[PDB]
Amino acid sequence: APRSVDWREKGYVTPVKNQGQCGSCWAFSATGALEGQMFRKTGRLISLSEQNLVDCSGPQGNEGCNGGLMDYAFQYVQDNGGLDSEESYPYEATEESCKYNPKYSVANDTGFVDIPKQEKALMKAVATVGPISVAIDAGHESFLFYKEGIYFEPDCSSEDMDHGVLVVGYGFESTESDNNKYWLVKNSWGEEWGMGGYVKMAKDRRNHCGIASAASYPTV
Ligand SMILES: *[C@H](CS(=O)(=O)c1ccccc1)[C@H](CCc1ccccc1)NC(=O)[C@H](Cc1ccccc1)NC(=O)N1CCN(C)CC1
Ligand SMILES: C[As](C)(=O)[O-]
Ligand SMILES: C[As](C)(=O)[O-]
Ligand SMILES: [Zn+2]
Ligand SMILES: [Zn+2]
Ligand SMILES: [Zn+2]
Ligand SMILES: [Zn+2]
Ligand SMILES: [Zn+2]
Ligand SMILES: [Zn+2]
Ligand SMILES: [Zn+2]
């Protein structure tokens, strides 16, 4: 596998969005992976509607602004037979009754695949599939005030995660006596958080913050 991957430079990744005051991270993670897979399929990078997912994927098990699962979001897109564009169905950071319009559907998926809970398996997936939906333990003050560098949190859990994000690549910063490897992770907290909306999560450091424990991607 490549020692460095960054799917943003390959056109797979849309700009950083902002979930606002709503626990819809799962929606932004799922649209991220679907935007990447649709781009691979059609050569078109189109922004997908998280609001469509928040309002409409309740039957699949999601809870709107109270949380959800990326896999349930992929199931909605399969069950629904489509997903509206971000332009047609813009994000409002609130829960509202479903407004899906089949006329504005710009994406489909045929299911999803769950990656084994090993960082090696996640790496090969990022290297060959594209951006990957993952969940991490982001429930700490250091994550909230992260600005730059490789994030490492000693109290992070490898099993208990609360935040759905998107891995768009990986790399390494090399010092004299250490290759400090990282996951390139796209947050949904606006572009003023972290590195323009991005965080470098510690990689190959015992599944730090659970990043390999709930990884999946949609199939198109
Ligand atoms: C998004 C993350 S967040 O809002 O940025 C956040 C919040 C707190 C701490 C860290 C990060 C949401 C937040 C859900 C939430 C709502 C209201 C109050 C507190 C939290 N997180 C989720 O949607 C997660 C995603 C996820 C996917 C896979 C594995 C682990 C987590 N899921 C989630 O919270 N739930 C709710 C309970 N339900 C049974 C499952 C989905
Ligand atoms: C502080 As916690 C329950 O997100 O590990
Ligand atoms: C937002 As929580 C207490 O499920 O980490
Ligand atoms: Zn560039
Ligand atoms: Zn959006
Ligand atoms: Zn409204
Ligand atoms: Zn899964
Ligand atoms: Zn938490
Ligand atoms: Zn924790
Ligand atoms: Zn928990």
Numbering used by the authors: 1 to 220
Paper text:
As a result, two inhibitors, K777 and E64d were identified with an IC50 value of 5.43 and 88.85 nM for CTSL, and 174.30 and 244.26 nM for CTSB. To explore the inhibition mechanism of K777 and E64d, we determined the crystal structures of these compounds bound to human CTSL and CTSB. All of these structures were solved at a high resolution with unambiguous electron density in the binding pocket of enzymes, allowing us to clearly define the interactions. Both CTSL and CTSB belong to the papain superfamily and have a typical cysteine protease fold. Two domains delimit an active-site cleft containing the conserved catalytic cysteine and histidine residues. In the structure of CTSL in complex with K777, this compound was found in the active site cleft. The density for K777 is connected to Cys25, evidence of a covalent bond. The sulfonyl group is located in the oxyanion hole formed by the side chains of Gln19, Trp189, and His163 and the main chain of Cys25, whose function is to stabilize the carbonyl oxygen of the substrate at the tetrahedral intermediate stage of proteolysis. In addition, K777 forms three hydrogen bonds with the backbone amides of Gly68 and Asp162. The phenyl sulfone, phenethyl, benzyl and N-methyl piperazine moieties of K777 insert into the S1'-S3 subsites, forming hydrophobic interactions which further stabilize the inhibitor. K777 and E64d, as endocytosis-mediated entrance pathway inhibitors, could effectively reduce the infectivity of the SARS-CoV-2 Omicron BA.2 variant in Calu-3 cells with an EC50 value of 14.0 nM (Selectivity index (SI) = 7,829, SI is calculated as the ratio of CC50 value against EC50 value, a common measurement for comparing cytotoxicity and antiviral potency of compounds) and 239.8 nM (SI > 4,000).
